[model samples]
Target: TLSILVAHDLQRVIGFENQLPWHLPNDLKHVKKLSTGHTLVMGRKTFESIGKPLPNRRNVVLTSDTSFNVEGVDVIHSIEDIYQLPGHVFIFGGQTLFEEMIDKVDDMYITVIEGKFRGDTFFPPYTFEDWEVASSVEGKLDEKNTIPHTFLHLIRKKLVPR
Candidate 1:
């Protein structure tokens, strides 16, 4: 199964900078556990933002441009080339890639925010109809933050069990 994870709002969806500027306190742990022994698919830009390969995770990056390079990360030219990935995979995106995989994604782990941000990047707009919030947990970011933030974890409801 492939899970799409992101945090975005109406302001911007993959802003001009091509980066996410929010905090997910324990997301690295979640990513490690969810993607352990599994493949992780992301766009080239996203991979670059990460700077290096995430240890213990099989990295797969999508790109149309051929000259791009990243050590230890398998590169694919199209989404069709590696669709049936073994184990759980994550489509960690930089906007375009997330839009590409949105329809096919089996679930989503959304961390909704109560406060808005002034940023160049954003997440894609989604319908609440086809997907349901199977689970959620809310937490407020500590007061020191310039703007308050809250985290909401959600899982898409529909998928044919593998």
Candidate 2:
């Protein structure tokens, strides 16, 4: 199964200058927990922002340039090349890639921030009409982050083949 993991603010802002606009320890830990022991796929730019492969996880970087290589990282030229992925696959992203692979994932783990924030990059626009909330947990506001948040698990509604 494929899942897309993302954290975005009320305005749908995901990043600013390749970095998160705010710091929330709980949210960060949430991501680490979900992605650990799974194959985490990301675009080259996203991988670069992360600087290095996350420990204890299989990092797959998608890049058009076959020459792109990093120590301890696997490279695939296209998203379609991911067909052979074993077990649960999670696509972590930086905008463009999220948009590219959005329709391909079966579910999404999203952290929704309660307030608006400044950001240079935004999550790609997607309709929630076809997704049903599978689960949700409300998060409290803390010093590290002023805004309250909610972690949501959404599953796309199964479409009947017509």
Candidate 3:
């Protein structure tokens, strides 16, 4: 199944200069737990931002440039190719990727950070009514962060028809 693992602030900001605006280790941990051992699909710039393939998972980068190549990652040139990849697929980054996948994903793993943020990238607006809360929990603030966050799992309503 195709899914998205992402974090955003109250303003729906998700990135700054190809990186996240905040350092939330807990969120990274959360990202790892869900993403581990899955097929992670992302765009070229997104792959570059992370620097390398995350260990213990299959990393596939989407790009139209057939000449583009990188170690330890598979290259895909189109969106249709994403469906052919094996296992649970997670579209994890790139504003363009997210924009292309907003309504196509089966579910979403989201971290709603509690704080103000300034960023150049924003998540595409989504309708709350189109999904059902699979689960929700308060992520307690630890020594790393002054502001807490919430973890949410949302599954799209079946009526939409993939």
Candidate 4:
């Protein structure tokens, strides 16, 4: 199955200057738990922002630049190549890639943080019209992190065949 794992604030702001705007360790842990042992597909900027390949996961970086190459990571020029992944794939992102793959993914694991943030990047716009909430957990405030958040699992509403 193909899925996307992302965290965004209430206003849908995801990143600031190529970095996350908040210090939410639980949210990061959720991403690591969900994406571990799966094929992670991301745009080149996402890969660069991360600095290194995530441990115990296969990393695939998508870029149109023919000469871009990084050791230990498989780099592909076309988004179509993502379909060739052997097993479960997670579309980890940097905005444009998410916009391209949203409609094609089976599920989305989203963390909705409670407050708005100032960021130059944003998660692509999407609606619940073609999706249904599968599960959710509302988190409470903690000493380390004051922002309350909700984790939502959304499954795409499948179309019926004629």
What is the C-alpha local distance difference test score of each model?
0.69, 0.88, 0.90, 0.89
In candidate 2, what are the lDDT values of residues 57-87, reduced to their tens digit?
Answer: 9999999986897999999997787778898
lDDT of 1 at 29: 49
Clashing pairs in 2: none
**lDDT comparison, 2 vs 3, better candidate:** 3
Better of 1 and 3 by TM-score: 3
With a 3 Å backbone cut-off (N, CA, C), the pairs that clash in candidate 1 are 12-122, 13-122, 14-122, 15-120, 15-121
Q: Give candidate 3's whole-model lDDT.
A: 0.90
C-alpha TM-scores of all predictions:
0.78, 0.93, 0.95, 0.93
lDDT of 3 at 36: 91
**Which candidate leads the pack in lDDT?**
3
Instruction: Give lDDT tens digits, candidate 4, residues 1-162.
Output: 899888889899989989999988888788888888889999999999999989889999999988877776999888889998989999999798888998899999999988999988888888887889999999766887677899999999987876
lDDT of 4 at 59: 92
**Regions of candidate 2 where Cα sits further than 4 Å from its true position:** 160-162
RMSD of each: 4.1, 1.8, 2.2, 1.8
Which parts of model 4 have CA positions greater than 4 angstroms off?
160-162
Model 3 TM-score (2 dp):
0.95
